[PDB]
Amino acid sequence: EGKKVPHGEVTLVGAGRLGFRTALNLMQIHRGGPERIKVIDGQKVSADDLIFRLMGAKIGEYKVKFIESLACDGFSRTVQGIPEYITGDNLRLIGGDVVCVEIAGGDTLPITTEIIRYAQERGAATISTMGVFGIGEEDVSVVDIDEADPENPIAAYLQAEGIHEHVLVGTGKLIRDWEPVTPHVLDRVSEVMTAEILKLLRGAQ
Ligand SMILES: Cc1c(O)nc(CC(=O)O)c(C)c1OP(=O)(O)OC[C@H]1O[C@@H](n2cnc3c(=O)[nH]c(N)nc32)[C@H](O)[C@@H]1O
Ligand SMILES: Nc1ncnc2c1ncn2[C@@H]1O[C@H](COP(=O)(O)OP(=O)(O)OP(=O)(O)O)[C@@H](O)[C@H]1O
């Protein structure tokens, strides 16, 4: 009878083991979700990326090309991938209604900060992680930036950098802690990550 639509553009900066799952969740959403999905990440599928290889990605393929490839010629929503790391130099790649940061490799916070500022300057809501380490059970929680635990390293850095109205998700277990990165945890983070993206997407109206 009365039929509803995808709206908005969502950028996912980072498309590794968590970013990929967020992409998958979003691509499967029906009667809503974003109309446009942008995935940005500079890295290739290697042997260790089982989650990609089980879906049939080849070693050597950029993660964002594999993901783009799943939106085959008849697919109704747009997925475009960009196989580049975000730097101070290519912030022109950051725009949309929601921007979601799920990156890892060294210290990611400076470039993240630059991402959240540039994106909120172009009126996008912003979201990212605060620790996705865990062995399986630990809780999945959500918080705004200015209510975040100040001992939490991410929240600390972003609050000191003067960031406001920024949504964070995580177990709160970190690089520092003993816990590794487990798939059930990345699934639950991803499920929650997606839901918070959707709230913020509705906010674009
Ligand atoms: C570090 C990390 C990872 O290995 N995997 C994933 C998922 C994936 O594979 O896609 C994410 C999201 C991730 O990032 P996380 O949310 O855990 O936090 C990243 C940032 O958070 C900071 N951070 C978090 N915990 C610590 C810590 O315990 N010590 C320090 N020095 N920095 C920390 C780091 O500087 C880093 O830039
Ligand atoms: N500056 C950046 N911009 C966009 N994506 C990034 C950036 N830095 C890291 N990433 C991506 O975030 C993802 C992190 O997830 P995961 O930990 O599974 O991957 P990774 O193999 O650790 O990658 P890396 O070797 O870059 O740390 C990676 O695919 C990585 O390419």
- Domain-wise residue ranges, the chain: 1-205
Residue 100 class from Cβ within 10 Å (0-12 exposed, 13-18 middle, 19+ buried)?
buried
Tokens of 99: 């921007």
The residue type at 57 = A
φ, ψ at 78 (rounded to 5°): -95, 130
Strand partners, 106: none
Protein residue with least CA distance to atom 25, ligand 2: 105
Burial class of 187 by CB neighbour count within 10 A (0 to 12, 13 to 18, 19+): middle
Contact 125, 204 (CB under 8 A): yes
191: left (phi over 0), alpha (psi -120 to 50) or beta: alpha
Please tell me what resolution, in angstroms, this structure has: 2.8
Q: For residue 145, give both structure tokens.
A: 């930036």
Distance CA 187, CA 200 (A): 20
Contact yes or no for 67/102 (Cβ under 8 A): no
In contact, 86 and 93? CB cutoff 8 Å? yes
With CA atoms as reference, report the closest residue to 129 among 147, 108, 110, 150.
Answer: 108
Rounded distance between C-alpha atoms, residue 124 and residue 197, angstroms: 11
Taking the C-alpha atoms of residue 26 and residue 191, their distance in angstroms, rounded to an integer, is 10
Q: How was this structure determined?
A: X-ray
| 143 CA from centroid of ligand 2 (Å) | 23
Distance CA 126, CA 116 (A): 6
Q: 165 near 125, Cβ under 8 Å?
A: yes
Ligand with minimal distance to 186 CA: 1
Candidate of 102, 103, 175 to mutate for ligand 2, largest count of ligand atoms within 8 Å of Cβ:
103
Q: At 204, phi and psi to the nearest 5?
A: -55, -5
105 C-alpha to center of ligand 2: Å?
6
Compute the half-sphere exposure of residue 147: CA atoms within 13 Å on the CB side of its CA: 8
The residue to which tokens 């049939």 are assigned: 56
The widest CA-to-CA distance across the chain, in whole angstroms, is 53
